[PDB]
Amino acid sequence: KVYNSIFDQAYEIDPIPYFNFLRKHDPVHYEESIDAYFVSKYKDVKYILKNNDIFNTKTLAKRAEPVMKDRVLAQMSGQEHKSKKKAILKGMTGKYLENLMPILEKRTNDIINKHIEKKEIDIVNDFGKVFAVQSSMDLLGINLENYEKIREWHNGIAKFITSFNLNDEEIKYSLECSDKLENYLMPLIKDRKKSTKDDLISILLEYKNDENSISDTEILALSLNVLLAATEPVDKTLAYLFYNLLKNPEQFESVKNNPKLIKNAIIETLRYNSPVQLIPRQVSKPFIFNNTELQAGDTVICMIGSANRDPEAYSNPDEFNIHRSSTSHSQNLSFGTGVHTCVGASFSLIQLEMVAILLLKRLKNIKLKTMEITEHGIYTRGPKSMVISFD
Numbered sequence: 001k002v003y004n005s006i007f008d009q010a011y012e013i014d015p016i017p018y019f020n021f022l023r024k025h026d027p028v029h030y031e032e033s034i035d036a037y038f039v040s041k042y043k044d045v046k047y048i049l050k051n052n053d054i055f056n057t058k059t060l061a062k063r064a065e066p067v068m069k070d071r072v073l074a075q076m077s078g079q080e081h082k083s084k085k086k087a088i089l090k091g092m093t094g095k096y097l098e099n100l101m102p103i104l105e106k107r108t109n110d111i112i113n114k115h116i117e118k119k120e121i122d123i124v125n126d127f128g129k130v131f132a133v134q135s136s137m138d139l140l141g142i143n144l145e146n147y148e149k150i151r152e153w154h155n156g157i158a159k160f161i162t163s164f165n166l167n168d169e170e171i172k173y174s175l176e177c178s179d180k181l182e183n184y185l186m187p188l189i190k191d192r193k194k195s196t197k198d199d200l201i202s203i204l205l206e207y208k209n210d211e212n213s214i215s216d217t218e219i220l221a222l223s224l225n226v227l228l229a230a231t232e233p234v235d236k237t238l239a240y241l242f243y244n245l246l247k248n249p250e251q252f253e254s255v256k257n258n259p260k261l262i263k264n265a266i267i268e269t270l271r272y273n274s275p276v277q278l279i280p281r282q283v284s285k286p287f288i289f290n291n292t293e294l295q296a297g298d299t300v301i302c303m304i305g306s307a308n309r310d311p312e313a314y315s316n317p318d319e320f321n322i323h324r325s326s327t328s329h330s331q332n333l334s335f336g337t338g339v340h341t342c343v344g345a346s347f348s349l350i351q352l353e354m355v356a357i358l359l360l361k362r363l364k365n366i367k368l369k370t371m372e373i374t375e376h377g378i379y380t381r382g383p384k385s386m387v388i389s390f391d
């Protein structure tokens with residue numbers, strides 16, 4: 001019998017002591033409430049994610065279908081997955097990327113311009129929440145007329161994607177969010193169909209696989225997948241980045257003095273406070289990790305934050321240090337690994353660096369006003385608020 005549960009209230013408050021207990025004493029940990037095994041060690045998480053044939057993404061189909069309306073990218077495999085992942089990458093690289101970043105600079109500067117005279121800003125609620133959804137819509141090609149309603153509908157769909165055992169009233173609200181978003185987006189996919197632009201929806205629209213376009217509802221599903229994914233972790237990461245730097249003045253100074261260190265500071269923030277905390281997989285056949293037996297059909301959930309703090313992977317893993325280099329250092333698992341590694345990983349780092357540079361440039365002598373954050377979410381996780389002041 002076990003007494004340390006992922007679903008104790010203490011875990012969401014502060015999961016770090018759970019990571020340390022689980023890695024040492026129960027590295028493949030069963031939770032009866034969701035009939036799943038939680039996997040906490042870097043080596044086991046890496047092996048599971050690298051072996052797409054033994055640990056497959058069928059678990060995601062059950063948690064994605066009701067709100068995304070058709071198959072998402074992580075559910076695909078083989079040539080379909082490879083080619084469609086490439087199409088998605090295309091919208092955020094090359095000339096698509098060069099066109100997009102000035103627009104995201106405009107989004108950044110318009111937010112700053114709204115708060116600059118107030119001499120404080122909430123990096124979570126004033127900047128990240130607003131910027132993340134506008135950014136996703138700019139990437140997709142959706143005009144910002146309705147970013148108010150899009151934000152609301154994104155939030156309900158995210159709640160569904162990132163929760164366990166929701167109550168019937170909650171599922172209802174999340175499905176009405178998903179319907180409203182579909183009711184909004186479907187006509188635009190059809191307008192883009194005969195008036196093609198240079199955005200991600202147009203890429204999906206002109207995608208062809210053996211002279212066979214993908215259905216409109218498949219395009220909707222992929223677009224919904226990108227909208228949700230490009231929005232949710234990016235805003236948490238930005239707030240974590242400035243909180244961690246401000247909580248370590250010496251490292252904030254090194255960043256200020258040498259802006260090239262911002263990328264390393266972003267990477268270390270993703271390692272330290274992994275915003276996507278869980279990755280589920282289904283076990284395809286009998287299998288054993290450590291001495292825990294798994295059966296075909298079992299669910300394993302990789303614990304990204306725990307893996308990224310594994311002392312087998314990193315020296316002093318529970319310390320934030322932007323100067324980590326190279327066991328005492330490994331590649332973090334913040335973006336996963338293997339077949340389903342985050343298509344938006346490079347774009348994420350570029351987005352966050354350009355936003356970080358503008359905040360440092362325009363807000364002078366930043367000081368922390370939220371001296372102690374509170375964090376929420378066990379699937380995705382971030383501060384509820386993170387206020388700074390400036391000159």
Ligand code: HEM
Pocket residue numbers: 073074075085225226229230231233234237270275276279280304333334335336337339340341342343344345347348
């Ligand atoms: C800090 C920001 C981000 C983090 C921490 C993050 C994290 C992750 C992780 C851990 C995975 C692996 C999921 C799995 O293996 O099942 C993933 C996959 C994915 N991410 Fe992100 N992501 C970020 C930003 C983005 C952005 C900006 C996009 C824009 C499209 C995006 C889209 C995707 C997609 C489509 C997948 C599925 C890719 C595939 O199945 O091959 N992500 N992400």
Ligand SMILES: c1ccc(-c2c[nH]cn2)cc1
Pocket residue numbers: 161162228229230232233276342380
């Ligand atoms: C749940 C699972 C994965 C994500 C995700 C992947 N890439 C960006 N965001 C968001 C919510």
